[PDB]
Amino acid sequence: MKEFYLTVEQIGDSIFERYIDSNGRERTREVEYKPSLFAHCPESQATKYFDIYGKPCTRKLFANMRDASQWIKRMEDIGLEALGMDDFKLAYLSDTYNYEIKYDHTKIRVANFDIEVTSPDGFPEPSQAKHPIDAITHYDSIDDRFYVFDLLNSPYGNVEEWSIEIAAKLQEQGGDEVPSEIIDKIIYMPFDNEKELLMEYLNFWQQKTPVILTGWNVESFAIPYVYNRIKNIFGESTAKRLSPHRKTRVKVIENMYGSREIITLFGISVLDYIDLYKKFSFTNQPSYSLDYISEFELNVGKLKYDGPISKLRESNHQRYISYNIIAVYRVLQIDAKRQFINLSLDMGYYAKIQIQSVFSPIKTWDAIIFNSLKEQNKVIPQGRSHPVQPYPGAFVKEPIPNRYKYVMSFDLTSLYPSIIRQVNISPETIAGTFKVAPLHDYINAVAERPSDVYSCSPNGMMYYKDRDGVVPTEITKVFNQRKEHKGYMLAAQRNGEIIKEALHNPNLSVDEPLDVDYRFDFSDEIKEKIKKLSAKSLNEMLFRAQRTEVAGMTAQINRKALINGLAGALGNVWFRYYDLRNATAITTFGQMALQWIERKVNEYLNEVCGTEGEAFVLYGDTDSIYVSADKIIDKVGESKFRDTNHWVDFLDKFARERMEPAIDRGFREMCEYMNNKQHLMFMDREAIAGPPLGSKGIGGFWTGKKRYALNVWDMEGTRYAEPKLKIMGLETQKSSTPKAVQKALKECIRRMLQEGEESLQEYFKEFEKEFRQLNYISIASVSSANNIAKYDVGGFPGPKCPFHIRGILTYNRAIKGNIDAPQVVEGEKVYVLPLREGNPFGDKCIAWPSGTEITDLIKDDVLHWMDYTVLLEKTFIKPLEGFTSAAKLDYEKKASLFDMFDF
DNA sequence: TCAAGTAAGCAGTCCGCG
DNA sequence: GCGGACTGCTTAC
Ligand SMILES: O=c1ccn([C@H]2C[C@H](O)[C@@H](COP(=O)(O)NP(=O)(O)OP(=O)(O)O)O2)c(=O)[nH]1
Ligand SMILES: [Ca+2]
Ligand SMILES: [Ca+2]
Ligand SMILES: [Ca+2]
Ligand SMILES: [Ca+2]
Ligand SMILES: [Ca+2]
Ligand SMILES: [Ca+2]
Ligand SMILES: [Ca+2]
């Protein structure tokens, strides 16, 4: 096999690399890597190295990395550019792996671990590590085993060994229900004392040294705690054995309102799953506890136990260990679904960076672009300092708040990356500037043509057309990968809908799910077999189709995130290729394109309808337009359609055969007007929306910018078995909105869009009557809580104190003096409830850590004083009033003359 | 919330608005 | 009581 790196580090003048050799063996080596950097040289001096602008450079080979770093300093002292890759390990990787890396995940040791620490005096601070580690479960991907290290004797209690037989039993048998499929994969090791436990763990670590280290909150808790605990018991040298190169560093992570410490283990790539999840999942959760996320992702019930966690080991050590093992498995289950580790490896090896650098788009793109240029013997420029400056972004049309019955939307393919490609926007393709007219003049095609020679953006920038810039070139490669995976995602999505349809008529029989690749549209043969399958088999296929779709979603959406991140990076001062001229060339072209096509679509449709100045485009945001199709439907006549699907087909055909060609013509003209290098503005139909044929549903409504709801029948070629609500921006979509309220508001919207005003009124009246029965957690608001200290005037709300912060201060007084009560963590999220006047908490609201039950110390009192009236009005009635006034409907039946008596 | 970008919504505080 | 200036938080893209 071809070799590939596992990890790389710079330690002084040595590169330390762990890698898989040509025989598939893990190896380590120390290399005295001599780096090269570059300086501009005279035209005379013959060279093969040129900077991205075509100016000649001399290569400087240094005796060692320290010399190179020092030279960079002196070059700054002199005031001259020091060119080349200043991150020496990236240059090392580029030299050592000068080919497209193909990696084998089966050779990469991926470790997933979790520890337990009993603490009777509150949260056990990793930086202190004053409490024994009493459990470690460590899963190894190469062995496919869970290694369980269990402390039987501690100052906080001596316990009996964990029993695998009881662990396997159902909760109803008194067991812990450790999943049967991992029972045989557990290697259990009890220990007489903590020193023994930790010494054995370190020996185990040495034999099975993680390459990728993951788990839940491992970077902020598990790793620093293990490191600091071993340091406290044995000393520094022993704790550094967690690093294969025996090198560690405390890293201070700074944010706006403080800082925290983590331990960097040289020679290990830490990918904390909570951070992977936050970056790659595209969710915003009310809580990020493993329990909450597992339930959300996997639909597994929370891990139940009696009493506080600080008494769990002593009271039920059996459950204690089982839950430690289950916690490790949950992360594995989430990754089996989401595949973020696979994604991270793909991206890391593609860019040739330390795997953990995938968290940084800037680092990722710096490496991709460096490797690309190096292949042509080109030399990258030095990074410079820039002051942070605001710059303009996308255009969003102000909609007329209203109901909108029939709607067709259209969307540009991967807009920002397409603009970069079309215009040829790159650091080295800048050709000059032209005199800009007001954006309106370009939108209306009355401005003078910018250039007869170069490719232009309406921000005034011109670009070369003779060759592609490196940014367009590299962005295209990733865009093409993204396209492939999106293809698989949509096929799986369409396949899912085929199965749902079949599920309307499941056969009475015993059979098996078909063995198929869900990434490709089902053939006619497969469809026929599906129509004969049992519900059991069909549901299994649906689950599998949906898992395939999730895998495709992960692969496609995060590759899109990467290329969009490059457009954004051009506007970040730490990016080597930072340039507001290029960042704004993109955004400004975007504004023109959206409004240009709005005009063209309006023009086209007015022509087809034979009307004048009518506004068909009702809304647009960045790269999408929403078109009223009422007149198109009315041209045929609603009474002439057989069913809902009939007009959906009709609108689909009209969009594809009439509107898209017109849109294409419009954008080709714009391309020529801007003299762009390549036409890549591809705007296809996205959604077809409307009420069910013959219903009183309103189809859709807008309340304002970034706030709307549509009843969609077809999305990007997926014809739904059942209509799907597309709701953007509304309270149903916000993590701050109480869970039960999201649900209720969503049902109100469904009724508005699908059934009509009377159905809406029926549901509202019922929710209003019954909501007081809802679990307090389901009706609590949620909010991140920052700057708590700023607003704490020992210990009451200071001036301008935010509502949720006030709740926290209320909570803090109510639990003061209590060492064991759960503390609100700065920067985390809290549940928030309003309190009725005269309550014993002495304030109008209380807040506690999200994803948790409020402590029994005050639960009863909170429940008794909860202000249901305020809650309802603020979280439900206000938003609903917004929806209904926009849609021009009433959520409460207004009086009429008919109310004048039945008999 | 360490880690690419801007636009823009709504809750809430403070306080004017005769 | 509503709206502006402002902070805080959260989405859409
Ligand atoms: O996180 C984002 C999302 C979007 N954008 C910009 C770039 C993107 O091209 C544009 C439109 O975003 P979409 O959600 O429409 N996705 P995009 O058009 O990039 O690809 P596609 O529409 O094909 O999914 O908005 C960002 O800069 N950052
Ligand atoms: Ca735990
Ligand atoms: Ca790849
Ligand atoms: Ca798009
Ligand atoms: Ca998309
Ligand atoms: Ca059937
Ligand atoms: Ca869009
Ligand atoms: Ca207001």
**Domain extents in chain A:** 1-108+340-382, 109-339, 383-468+573-729, 469-572, 730-774+867-888, 775-866
- The finding on whether A485 has its CB within 6 A of some atom of ligand 1 is no
Token reading at A316: 């039920």
Tokens of A150: 């269990």
Contacts of A622 (CB under 8 A, 6+ apart): A394, A395, A396, A415, A590, A594
CB contact set of A183 (below 8 Å; sequence gap of 6+): A164, A167, A168
Ligand 8 mean position to A677 CA, how many Å? 48
Q: Is A589 in the pocket of ligand 1 (CB under 6 A)?
A: no
Architecture of domain A775-866: 3-Layer(aba) Sandwich (3.40)
Q: What angle do CA A401, A406, A407 make, to 5 degrees?
A: 75
Is the four-CA dihedral A323, A324, A325, A329 of positive or negative sign?
positive
Say how far apart CA A219 and CA A200 lie, in whole Å.
22
Specify the DSSP class assigned to residue A218. I
Answer whether A351's CB lies under 8 Å from A193's CB.
no
A150 lines ligand 1 (CB under 6 A): no
What resolution in angstroms, rounded to 1 decimal?
2.0
Instruction: Give φ, ψ of A577 to 5 degrees.
Output: -110, 25
Contacts of A494 (CB under 8 A, 6+ apart): A521, A717, A718, A719
Which of A 859-888 have CB under 7 A of nucleic chain B? 874, 878-879, 882
DSSP letter at A835 equals: B
* Ligand 1 atom nearest to A557, measured from its CA: 24
**Does the nearest atom of strand B lie within 7 Å of A572's Cβ?**
yes
CATH code for the structural domain at A383-468+573-729: 3.90.1600.10
Query: What is the Å distance from ligand 2's center to A723 Cα?
Result: 42
Tokens 């930072």 appear where? A578
Query: What six digits make up the tokens of A708?
Result: 């709307």
Q: How far apart are CA A639 and CA A442, in angstroms?
A: 43
Round to the nearest angstrom and report the end-to-end CA distance of chain A. 91
A561 CA: nearest ligand 1 atom: 1
- Cβ neighbours for A732, distance < 8 A, ≥ 6 positions apart: A742, A745, A746, A749
Query: What's the Å distance between residue A335 CA and nucleotide B18 C1'?
Result: 65
Counting ligand 1 atoms within 8 A of each CB, the residue from A414, A558, A589 with the most, and so the one to mutate, is: A414
CA distance A90 to A353: 6
Amino acid identity of A65? M
The verdict on whether omega for the bond into residue A795 sits within 30 degrees of 0, i.e. cis, is yes
Distance CA A473, CA A371 (A): 12
Given a contact cutoff of 8 angstroms between Cβ atoms, the answer to whether A656 and A410 are in contact is no
- The backbone torsions φ and ψ at residue A522, rounded to the nearest 5 degrees and listed phi first, read -55, 135
Cα A694 from Cα A697, distance rounded (Å): 9
Cβ(A1)–Cβ(A24) below 8 Å: yes
CA atoms of A784 and A852, how far apart (whole Å):
15
Class of the A730-774+867-888 domain? mainly alpha
Measure the CA–CA gap between A859 and A856, rounded to whole angstroms.
5
Protein CB footprint (7 Å) on chain C nucleotides? 7-13
- Protein residue whose Cα sits closest to atom 20 of ligand 1: A414
Return the biggest CA–CA distance within chain A. 109
Distance, CA of A394 to CA of A584 (rounded, Å): 10
Fold match flag (A730-774+867-888 vs A775-866): no
The finding on whether A114 has its CB within 6 A of some atom of ligand 1 is: no
Distance CA A452, CA A672 (A): 10
Assess whether the C-beta atom of A686 lies below 6 angstroms from ligand 1. no
**Euclidean distance between CA atoms A826 and A845, whole angstroms:** 18
Distance CA A279, CA A270 (A): 15
Experimental method: X-ray
Ligand 1: does its nearest atom lie under 6 Å from the Cβ of A570? no
What distance in angstroms lies between residue A686's CA and the mean position of ligand 7's atoms?
A: 9
Q: Is the CB of A623 under 6 A from ligand 1?
A: yes
Atom of ligand 1 nearest to the CA of A417: 9
Q: Where are the beta strands (DSSP E) in A636-747?
A: 683-689, 700-704, 707-715, 718-728
- Residues present in chain A in total: 903
- Second-level CATH architecture of A1-108+340-382: 2-Layer Sandwich (3.30)
Around Cβ A836, how many Cβ atoms within 10 Å? 13
The dihedral built from the CA positions of residue A333, A335, A336 and A337, taken in this order, carries a sign that is positive
Residues 193-222 of A with CB under 7 A from strand B: 219
Q: How many angstroms separate the CA of A217 from the C1' of B3? A: 16
CATH number of A469-572: 1.10.287.690
C-beta of A670 in contact with ligand 1 (< 6 A): no
Q: How far apart are CA A235 and CA A95, in angstroms?
A: 38
Domain A109-339 = CATH 3.10.150.10? no
Q: Nearest residue to C10, CA vs C1'? A: A734
- Token code pair at residue A521: 């549209």
Partners of A626 in beta bridges: A409, A619
The rounded distance, in Å, linking the Cα atoms of A254 and A257 is 8
Buried b (16+ CB within 10 A) or exposed e, A172-207: eeebbbbeeebeeebebebbeebeebbbebbebbee
Minimal-distance CA residue to ligand 1 atom 27:
A564
